[PDB]
Design a binder for this molecule. Structure first.
Ligand SMILES: C[N+](C)(C)CCOP(=O)(O)O
Ligand SMILES: C[N+](C)(C)CCOP(=O)(O)O
Lengths: 132, 132
């Protein structure tokens, strides 16, 4: 039976860390639909910080990712129970409390980040490790 | 009938431009297997220039790309006719002469780059457009 997974995020400058997280969410059960929510520029800036890529750029890259079945772009900043019913979502997948209500309901699936793999760190790599 | 497509490249700091190129190669015919060749650190440096990501890092990202069916990593720097027979490749897909022999044989499929979308340009974006 197919299980609908929802993974929201900014997905700015998508890197191997994001990709492994999406893979993990896609693979939480044998048969899934992975829906990915991409947060708006305005709300990301307002609640998180400056985004490098636009909503359109962040959404267009996700389309090329193997694990992504459906995209909600933009997505709401805060998951609600109405949202879960509206899109028939069985589990919310996110790094790990604003998610307590999901955990209480049995609908939270923790996914893990990967340190050091970010695009930021790859410029930091060529810096210090060259041009001195 | 399934058509085997071979697309080689450095695939350093994979960006939307690479992804659209891979999509294009994957979609050259109705049914394909897209094999992607990832060039070695040594030969890339020797023939092209410094690479940011290692062979392993460049190969691991490609695994997450929807369009990629198989990966040869590392791949030879120069395609040969023996290589085509060894992997049963029907067409080489590459941006557009070292490919004249492929074109002469009917086995070359040009794919297009996309300007401005590169990770280099996205740091250039936040620079000049901020921290002044
Ligand atoms: C924006 N949000 C509150 C829905 C989730 C935060 O997303 P990220 O912090 O995993 O990018
Ligand atoms: C390395 N090569 C000669 C096989 C193809 C060059 O690859 P790219 O220049 O498309 O990255």
């Amino acid at each position: 039976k197919n299980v609908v997974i929802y993974a929201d995020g900014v997905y700015d400058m998508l890197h191997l860390g994001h990709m492994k997280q999406l893979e993990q969410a896609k693979k939480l059960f044998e048969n899934t639909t992975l829906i990915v929510g991409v947060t708006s520029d305005n709300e990301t800036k307002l609640f998180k910080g400056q985004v490098v890529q636009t909503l359109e750029e962040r959404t267009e890259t996700l389309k090329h990712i193997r694990w992504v079945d459906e995209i909600i772009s933009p997505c709401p900043w805060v998951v609600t129970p109405e949202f879960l019913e509206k899109y028939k979502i069985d589990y919310v997948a996110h790094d790990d409390d604003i998610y307590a209500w999901l955990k209480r309901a049995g609908k939270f699936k923790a996914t893990q980040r990967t340190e050091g793999v970010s695009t930021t760190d790859l410029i930091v790599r060529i810096l210090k490790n060259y041009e001195d």
